[PDB]
Structures are given as structure tokens and as C-alpha cells.
């Protein structure tokens, strides 16, 4: 699962923070967009 | 502009006037004050009467201010017995002649003063209006006066041939005026071919408590109804300073203000022994007022249930049994000032009303989580609180006029 600790108070922030960053048409359907792999690959730390 | 205008700034004067055989708030007009007092006498009377007509286990709710205000719109053009009944039922026959002759105008002033809050954590919203069949010819003087003093003119509709369509037209106006909230003041088939004149008076309050209840403290607890039974209700709780007072025969009075303090909710809770009914029979304008004066801030704990009450009763029926008869009679109705003659005489075919109150941890008409937790709240099991786990009375009032905007009874907040 996706672990995320909220920071704001929904009383003033409104709602949506708990499920922030997960796209209905992508993450939530276990689908990847055409270029996100490029971002994941950039975390490589060559030695 | 009416809020700044004066009685003579715009010549009105009804077609008929009535005469009875026989510490005012600072920055407050005397006329408006006496008119607020009149509504308060109507409030108690209309309330006791309604309670006598229902089951002591039913919740009761109404906006006397809304009712008085709207029916004063008919006064403006009533004569003879019709007018006298209006004056006596709504207690208007108990005020000065000037205020009486200009009643409509002063209701406008009174209302201007009430809607000068909008501390957006405190919004009062209303929509009042009259609709008459378009076959009739309405007095234009009335219409103009209505335009200024009431905001709108009586809207002509075709009840005779376009009943359902006219229903939608009325609902639409209200759905817009209270934007979204009230979209069906007039229910299915309420308007029809025999419909000639309809009174529509709606109103509700949106406000946040100055001191909210913590959702974390609300627990499913028992509410001891009047029929002896008991049920589960989301009982809220909190500790804090509040204006309170233990009165005669052990009755308890508590005031919970909304953000701003110009509008509060007052609760009257009898002791387990004495029943609510007894109290209602003793509830007079001076009794209620004497109680409120006795209030003083105290640090205390409060157990109050979430509740939703509405004005589900027939206004016309209720008023007829109180004395307002002619206004509703096709034969005896005397409304010259709105439409003249005698072919089909003008009478009120229906008084559609809508007033409700939804109270939760956040306030009135405020959104809050339904989810009710189950955990320890670390409370003194031997605590002594204002515990409203049995039938109590409710008042929504405006300070400093003491105007009773809403009044009711919470007999069953369960389910």
C-alpha cells in the first residue's frame, strides 16, 4: 500500500490530503503513464 | 432602500386599519422593539396550541417570526373580520396605532436589523412571497408597497390551467432565493385548479458554535423519551464556560451562542421528575425572559444530542383552530387591498412553510463527520452536567432584541 502521513488539518485545509498524489486513471488502476519510468530511472546512483 | 428609509419617506397606508376596543435596547427603534415583543407573545401561544395538538413524543419546530412576518403581508390588504382575526391571532392588536397602521414597514425594519449579522459563521436565510391566480387583477398600490417593504411583488401564476407548472415556478424561485437548500417548498400536487392565493414562507439558519463539540467526545447513548421507552442517540459532550441557570422546580436553562454572539440557542430542560408538558403550560413571554435575565456564565459540562427537527404540521389548520378563519374562507375572506370586487372573492388557499434545524458538533446547518468513535474520554463517572438525555425545549434567538426566530422541542433525536 501507499504510506502517507498527513500534515495539515482538514478543518482548514479541506479534504483530499490523505489520498494525495495517486492518480485515478493511473496509480489507482495500476497503470503507468508514457514517461514516468523516466523519472523512476533517474534515481539511479552510478558508482 | 428600506433599511434607512422612514415611514413618511414612502406613503403607504392600508385600505383598512384596525383599532382595539381598548428598558429598551440601545441603538434600537422603539417601534421595532414593541413589534418584536408582539411576535414573542404569538410564539408562546402558537407553540402551546401546537403542543396540545400533538403527541408528546413528537419533535416540534417552527419559526414564529417567519409566520408573523408573512401573515402581516395579508394584513396590508385585509378588512373587517378578516383583518380583526389577523390582528388578534398574531397579537398585533396589542401595539400602538402607528406601528399597527405601518406594520408591514416595521417588519421590514425589524428584518433589516436581523440580517445585519452575516458573520458568515452566522447566516440567516429566508424567502417569503405570495402567489395569486393570474385571472385576478391585483391592486398596483399594493404591488408597489410590496416591492419595497417585502422585496418582491405578489407573483401571478396560472393555478387554473397550469397548476403543476406553477408549482415548479414557485419551487424554482425559492430554490434560487435560498440557493439550493429549499428546492421543494411546495410538494407534489399541492397546487391545483381550485388554488387562488398561496403564502410561501421559508427560513433556516447556518451558524457555527462559538464553542464547538469535539467529534471525538460524541457517543451512542440512551435518550429517555416521554412514552417511557428509551432509544440510542448521538450524544455530544464538552466542558466549558456557558451562561447557565438552575431555576424553579429544578428546571435548567442553558445558552449556547453561535460565532458572533448575536444569535444563540437556549435549552430548557426540566428535572427527570417534572415533565416537559408542565413547563410548556407555564411558558409565557415574561417567564422565558425572566429566565434569560437570570443566566450567568459558569464552567460546566454538557451532554447534548445531535438532532434534526422540522415544522411538519399544517399552518393553515393550526391557525384556523386559533381564530384565523375568514382569511381562509372563500366566502368570508376580506382582502380588498389586494384584489377588489366579489365575483370569486380572494382568500388564502394555502400557507406553505418550511423551517428546520440540524444541530451537530459544528453547529447549525454545518457539515461534520457522522462517524462516531468508541474510546475512553477520561470523564468523571460521577460528573454533574446539563444532561439533555430527555425531552427539552429549544429556542434560537437574536440578542439584544430577544427576538424569537425559532422555537421547538426535541422529544426524539434518535434513529
Amino acid at each position: 500500500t501507499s504510506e502517507y502521513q498527513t500534515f495539515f488539518n482538514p478543518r482548514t485545509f479541506g479534504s483530499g490530503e490523505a489520498d494525495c498524489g495517486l492518480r485515478p486513471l493511473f496509480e489507482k488502476k495500476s497503470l503507468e503513464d508514457k514517461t514516468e519510468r523516466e523519472l523512476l530511472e533517474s534515481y539511479i546512483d552510478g558508482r | 432602500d428600506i433599511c434607512t428609509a422612514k415611514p413618511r419617506d414612502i406613503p403607504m397606508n392600508p385600505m383598512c386599519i384596525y383599532r382595539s376596543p381598548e428598558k429598551i435596547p440601545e441603538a434600537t427603534n422603539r417601534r421595532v422593539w414593541e413589534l418584536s415583543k408582539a411576535n414573542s407573545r404569538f410564539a408562546t401561544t402558537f407553540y402551546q396550541h401546537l403542543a396540545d395538538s400533538k403527541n408528546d413524543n413528537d419533535n416540534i419546530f417552527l419559526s414564529p417570526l417567519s409566520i408573523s412576518t408573512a401573515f402581516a403581508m395579508t394584513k396590508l390588504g385585509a378588512c373587517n373580520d378578516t383583518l380583526q382575526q389577523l390582528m388578534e391571532v398574531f397579537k398585533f392588536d396589542t401595539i400602538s396605532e402607528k406601528t399597527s397602521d405601518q406594520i408591514h414597514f416595521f417588519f421590514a425594519k425589524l428584518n433589516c436589523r436581523l440580517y445585519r449579522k452575516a458573520n458568515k459563521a452566522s447566516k440567516l436565510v429566508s424567502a417569503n412571497r405570495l402567489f395569486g391566480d393570474k385571472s385576478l387583477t391585483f391592486n398596483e398600490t399594493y404591488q408597489d408597497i410590496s416591492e419595497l417593504v417585502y422585496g418582491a411583488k405578489l407573483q401571478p401564476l396560472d393555478f387554473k390551467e397550469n397548476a403543476e407548472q406553477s408549482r415548479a415556478a414557485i419551487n424554482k424561485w425559492v430554490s434560487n432565493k435560498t440557493e439550493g437548500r429549499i428546492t421543494d417548498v411546495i410538494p407534489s400536487e399541492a397546487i391545483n385548479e381550485l388554488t387562488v392565493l398561496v403564502l410561501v414562507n421559508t427560513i433556516y439558519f447556518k451558524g457555527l458554535w462559538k464553542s464547538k463539540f469535539s467529534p471525538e467526545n460524541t457517543r451512542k447513548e440512551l435518550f429517555y423519551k416521554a412514552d417511557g421507552e428509551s432509544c440510542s442517540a448521538s450524544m455530544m459532550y464538552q466542558e466549558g464556560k456557558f451562561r447557565y441557570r438552575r431555576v424553579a422546580e429544578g428546571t435548567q436553562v442553558l445558552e449556547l451562542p453561535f460565532k458572533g454572539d448575536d444569535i444563540t440557542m437556549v435549552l430548557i430542560l426540566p428535572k427527570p421528575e417534572k415533565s416537559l408538558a408542565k413547563v410548556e403550560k407555564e411558558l409565557t413571554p415574561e417567564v422565558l425572559q425572566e429566565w434569560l435575565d437570570e443566566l450567568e456564565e459558569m464552567m460546566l459540562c454538557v451532554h447534548m444530542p445531535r438532532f434534526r427537527i422540522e415544522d411538519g404540521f399544517s399552518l393553515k389548520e393550526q391557525l384556523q383552530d386559533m381564530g384565523l378563519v375568514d382569511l381562509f374562507s372563500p366566502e368570508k375572506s376580506k382582502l380588498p387591498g389586494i384584489v377588489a370586487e366579489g365575483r370569486d372573492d380572494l382568500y388564502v388557499s394555502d400557507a406553505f412553510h418550511k423551517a428546520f434545524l440540524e444541530v451537530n458538533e459544528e453547529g447549525s446547518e454545518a457539515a461534520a463527520s457522522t462517524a462516531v468513535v468508541i474510546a475512553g474520554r477520561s470523564l468523571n463517572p460521577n460528573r454533574v452536567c446539563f444532561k439533555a438525555n430527555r425531552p427539552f425545549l429549544v429556542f434560537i434567538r437574536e440578542v439584544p432584541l430577544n427576538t424569537i426566530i425559532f422555537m421547538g422541542r426535541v422529544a426524539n433525536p434518535c434513529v
Binding site: 501507499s2 504510506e3 502517507y4 502521513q5 500534515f7 495539515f8 488539518n9 478543518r11 482548514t12 485545509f13 479541506g14 479534504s15 483530499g16 490530503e17 489520498d19 494525495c20 498524489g21 495517486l22 492518480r23 485515478p24 486513471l25 493511473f26 496509480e27 503513464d33 508514457k34 514517461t35 514516468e36 523516466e38 523519472l39 523512476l40 533517474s42 534515481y43 | -
Partner: protein, 252 residues
């Protein structure tokens, strides 16, 4: 966005379009962080040099859009602004320091397949992801080149650049409240944000929880996609103290 490509549907559900009521025109990009709050660049709201000093009433936000020029019925949602909040330390005289602003929606927007908020980073995420060589993504309906406008939202991924390299790349005084991104000349590839994209989000996906975090706001640059030059973005985490303060006292 220069050298980008059409975004896919629902690819950036937190993408917000700032629109001017009169005359009707596209102003900037922005991002949704909740159902009632929207983030953007300060100079998109206040920038005398372009004689812009908007108030809540002059603006409007359109959410869940893809097409730049069409009204996407039943898909996009429009909201009025209740209040605008510009960073009190925003510097429009010199270098657009602290180029950030918050906008409260008059009425909460409803989330859908096309509308969903992005996450704001914490200290660890910021320290971990915001490093030279790691790539983020920028989106917007801005210009396609320095010297015209796309039909649909554009997207491009760019590598974070080392601070000393950002600093030596321009004579403009840069601050800790900004970071720069873009390919170096010796890297071959290119891409950049451009006029019209300001306010838009620079996002990164966390490999820890698979969520998208907004690390920056498109702010400024010198021309668009020039060699040896980099786009600059408002460092969001660095200004979180202000983001939290504003939301705490004006949110409810």
C-alpha cells in the same frame, strides 16, 4: 512548454488553469493541493512591470482540463476565488524571490478521474528527491518556443541541476528559495517551461510510496530552452512555513 509532448488524460489531475474574467484570457498555471486550496506563482497575481494586480473578483480557476482552448463540458470544473494570499516576502523588484501564492476556492471542487490533488513534501522527501540528476516533471499550456500555443496540456521531464551550476549560469541573483532544472549543453537533450507556464507544478514521484509530490512552481528563466541556461522554480518545501500559516488562519 518547449520540447514536450501532449499530456495523457488524467495524467496531471492537479493541474489548474488561472483564467481572467475580463477580458477573457488564459493567465497562468496552478496546482490543486486540496478541495479548497490552489497553489500558484505570486507574479501571476502581482507584477507591476506587466501592470498586473488582480483581486479575487478578477480571476477564475478551471480544473480538470486537457484542451487549452475548449470548454470541456461535464469534465472541467470552474471555481471562483474567495481570497488570494501572496507571500509577504515576495520580491517582484529584483529576482522573483519567494514567487508563491495561495488561492482559496469559493466552493470546494469535487474530485474525479480528472481532478485530484497533489502532495506537498515534508523535510525528508524534499531532502531525498531534490538532488542533482533526479528528474521531475513540468506541465502547462504555455508557449512552445521562446520566439505558438499548444492545443492540449504539454508535459516534459527535466533533471534537477546542481546549485553552483544554477548560480554560475546567470548573473541574476538566485536564492535558496529557488532551484533550477534542465539539461546541460553537453547532455544533448533539451526541454524547458516557457512564458505562460508560470504557476504550474514541477512534480516528482516518490519511489517510497509511489505518490506524486509538488517540489516547485514554474517561476522564471532567461528566454526558453537556451543552451547553458536553466528554468527556475520556487522551492515549495522551503516556503512551507508560510503555506501552513496562511492555511491555518484563513482556511476554515
Amino acid at each position: 512548454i518547449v520540447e514536450g509532448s501532449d499530456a495523457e488524460i488524467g495524467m496531471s489531475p492537479w493541474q489548474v488553469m488561472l483564467f481572467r474574467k475580463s477580458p477573457q484570457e488564459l493567465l497562468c498555471g496552478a496546482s490543486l493541493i486540496s478541495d479548497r486550496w490552489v497553489l500558484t506563482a505570486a507574479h501571476c497575481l502581482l507584477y507591476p512591470p506587466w501592470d498586473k494586480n488582480f483581486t479575487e473578483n478578477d480571476l477564475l480557476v478551471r480544473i480538470g482540463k486537457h484542451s487549452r482552448t475548449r470548454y470541456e463540458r461535464n469534465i472541467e470544473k470552474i471555481s471562483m476565488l474567495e481570497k488570494i494570499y501572496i507571500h509577504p516576502r515576495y520580491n517582484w523588484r529584483e529576482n522573483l524571490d519567494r514567487d508563491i501564492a495561495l488561492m482559496k476556492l469559493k466552493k470546494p471542487v469535487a474530485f474525479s478521474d480528472y481532478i485530484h490533488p497533489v502532495c506537498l513534501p515534508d523535510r525528508e522527501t524534499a531532502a531525498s528527491l531534490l538532488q542533482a540528476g533526479y528528474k521531475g516533471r513540468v506541465t502547462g499550456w504555455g508557449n512552445l518556443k521562446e520566439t505558438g500555443q499548444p492545443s492540449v496540456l504539454q508535459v516534459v521531464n527535466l533533471p534537477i541541476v546542481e546549485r553552483p551550476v544554477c548560480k554560475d549560469s546567470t548573473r541574476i541573483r538566485i536564492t535558496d528559495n529557488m532551484f533550477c532544472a534542465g539539461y546541460k549543453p553537453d547532455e544533448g537533450k533539451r526541454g524547458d517551461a516557457c512564458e505562460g507556464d508560470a504557476g504550474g507544478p514541477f512534480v516528482m514521484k516518490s519511489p517510497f510510496n509511489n505518490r506524486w509530490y509538488q517540489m516547485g512552481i514554474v517561476s522564471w528563466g532567461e528566454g526558453c530552452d537556451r543552451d547553458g541556461k536553466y528554468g527556475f522554480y520556487t522551492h515549495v518545501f522551503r516556503l512551507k512555513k508560510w503555506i501552513q500559516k496562511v492555511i491555518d488562519q484563513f482556511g476554515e
